[PDB]
Amino acid sequence: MRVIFSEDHKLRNAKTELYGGELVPPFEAPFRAEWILAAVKEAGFDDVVAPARHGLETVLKVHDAGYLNFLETAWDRWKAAGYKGEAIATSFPVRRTSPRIPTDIEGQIGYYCNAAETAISPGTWEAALSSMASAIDGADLIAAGHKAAFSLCRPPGHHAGIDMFGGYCFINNAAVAAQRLLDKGAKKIAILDVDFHHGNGTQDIFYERGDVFFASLHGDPAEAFPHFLGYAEETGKGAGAGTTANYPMGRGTPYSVWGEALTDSLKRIAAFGAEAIVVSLGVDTFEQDPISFFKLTSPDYITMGRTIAASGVPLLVVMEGGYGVPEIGLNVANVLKGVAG
Amino acid sequence: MRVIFSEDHKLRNAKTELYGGELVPPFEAPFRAEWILAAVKEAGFDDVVAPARHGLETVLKVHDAGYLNFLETAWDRWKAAGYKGEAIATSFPVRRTSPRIPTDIEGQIGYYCNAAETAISPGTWEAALSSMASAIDGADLIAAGHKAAFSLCRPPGHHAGIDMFGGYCFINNAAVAAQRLLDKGAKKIAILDVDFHHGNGTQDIFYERGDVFFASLHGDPAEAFPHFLGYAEETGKGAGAGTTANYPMGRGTPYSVWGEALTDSLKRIAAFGAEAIVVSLGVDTFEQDPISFFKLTSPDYITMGRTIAASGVPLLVVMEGGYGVPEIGLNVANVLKGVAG
Ligand SMILES: NCCCCCC(=O)NO
Ligand SMILES: NCCCCCC(=O)NO
Ligand SMILES: [K+]
Ligand SMILES: [K+]
Ligand code: NA
Ligand code: NA
Ligand SMILES: [Zn+2]
Ligand SMILES: [Zn+2]
Ligand SMILES: [Zn+2]
Ligand SMILES: [Zn+2]
Secondary structure, eight states, X not given: OEEEOOGGGGGOOOXXXXXXXXXXXXXXXXXXXXXXXXXXXXXXXXXXXXXXXXXXXXXXXXXXXXXXXXXXXXXXXXXXXXXXXXXOOOBOOOTTOOOOOOSSHHHHHHHTBSBTTOOBOTTHHHHHHHHHHHHHHHHHHHHTTOXXXXXXXXXXXXXXXXXXXXXXXXXXXXXXXXXXXXXXXXXXXXXXXXXXXXXXXXHHHHTTOSSEEEEEEEEOTTSSTTOSSOOTTOOOOGXXXXXXXXXXXXXXXXXXXXXXXXXXXXXXXXXXXXXXXXEEEOOTTBTTOTTXXXXXXXXXXXXXXXXXXXXXXXXXXXEOOOOSSTHXXXXXXXXXXXXXX | OEEEOOGGGGGOOOSOEEETTEEXXXXXXXXXXXXXXXXXXXXXXXXXXXXXXOOSTTGGGTSOHHHHHHHHHHHHHHHHTTOSSOBOOOBOOOXXXXXXXXXXXXXXXXXXBSBTTOOBOTTHHHHHHHHHHHHHHHHHHHHTTOSEEEEOOSSOOTTOBTTBBBTTBSSOHHHHHHHHHHHTTOSXXXXXXXXXXXXXXXXXXXXXXXXXXXXXXXXXTTSSTTOSSOOTTOOOOGGGTTOEEEEEEOTTOOHXXXXXXXXXXXXXXXXHTOSSEEEEEOOTTBTTOTTOOOOBOHHHHHHHXXXXXXXXXXXXXXXXXXXXXXXXXXXXXXXXXXXXX
């Protein structure tokens, strides 16, 4: 299977992340892509190609235009305003606020942000576009008839909602890929989000859409980021009724339990009639992940990939989270081995 | 006139504030109260007394109980969770989120926060209670028949809404004072917020209440904190229809313009029939204020106090913002001179 990867991920190399009340070096740093790429090559996945560049045609169908315009100039405006650190939102449009959009950079960065633990830095927009492009080229391979491909996206995407960035994410790569598959002729697509964290951005994008089914397995939002979406009761609205399936799970969850949710999610995807599945793959479900509380082991990732591929429909695997140790690479490679075996 | 002031304000002495993507020493620092107290004494206002302590009876009528419980234990829980910095929210319940309240400290601090530029630090709750007490004792003087009093509140209050802290504020002192006056027998009370920033917390508390009229003069939210409330179109809802009057103003506004809005706000208050006015006094409208863009001069504060007192109704002056330079003291004292002259 082909691996799509852009060296332009390195353009996002932020200096800071607000974590535990301190500004620390970010968990979502360029070494992650290095570790993952090396491991997938070691596992025999050496058909690695750069994505073609893409404009905004596909992404404008999943993200708000004002939001994308904001991201394109946010750094420049922040710097022009004279601030000394990276661009970090402080005020947010929370309960019982005006719906109006501010005009200045401080107001707008809050308007367009869901979490202050993500700084915008120089090169962020360009990096996000490259990561989007990897997702689009992966989707194009599936649309053209391949049964599997891996888009090594960085920065990740699944916390970026219609008009918000946060959780280390700016453009929702998986959502763009699903949209691309629809644009290339599919009528029904599923996104299966196996990252430890709820894909609240993805959920937001497709919540009222019946052409995409979204399933997520994740740490319970009562005790895990993103905190404000991901409950089991959220099943969709309007035309999207019945097309969100959330599987929140608790501390210490091992594969024997997590895999039962996976089985159920795949039943619901099959009942929906997905023509392909975009897998939002985070390996922060690993037992040594520094910010997460599930207990998957490295061999479990092989099982996971095999189970998802036994759906019998084409898969695009899109990289999300997984932190701290180079075994993030082994874990990703193991999912691919399960898909390919 | 009596000045009510608690030395327990110093229990809030946070080390960090998120400003311009950096963690810097907070603007809202204990030395502010020292500067103000010294200046008011120098101006002849030396009848300074500590407040009696108060429990939660009055404050529970303006703030949510869950919110107050959260503030009680927030520091302890943050520290117990192992975080190394002060307690700063990251994830917020923004557009299209679940209304559910998380259970852990990370989730709850975001649920109960409107702005990440305010850290909770040890002593914050205790300090906030002392500041509330100064407002209550001031209100009790007005209720008993005095025509003016000054509550030297710190921390300030007007950004604290029904169930959220932010903007250096935790308990809405002015709202508690207004409630106290109602509880002591008033039927109609006004709050007049002359701090540079919109009193979004105060607005939130009284937006659907017809017993309190809220008027605020402030930097336009399109280009000023708090960014997401304070537009002129916001006039109230339900039982509070017609009882909010916002006067947003732009960069460089001097007294010749600001005073026209003051005149109009007082006309509105008189038509409402306020039995007393709680003045949320910030002196961050000063031409040297480091975080604000109005151009009031020190003499203008005398004019301001005299104009507000010419309403002919009792005043409780409640301290809010004003930063950076020891002249914040002169400016506050000048308002009191205008009231007393
Ligand atoms: N900064 C707090 C954690 C943000 C979520 C990161 C992630 O891995 N999402 O999938
Ligand atoms: N940290 C951003 C500014 C918060 C405004 C504080 C204030 O003076 N409110 O009245
Ligand atoms: K997930
Ligand atoms: K104001
Ligand atoms: Na949907
Ligand atoms: Na009202
Ligand atoms: Zn193929
Ligand atoms: Zn994750
Ligand atoms: Zn008196
Ligand atoms: Zn202010």
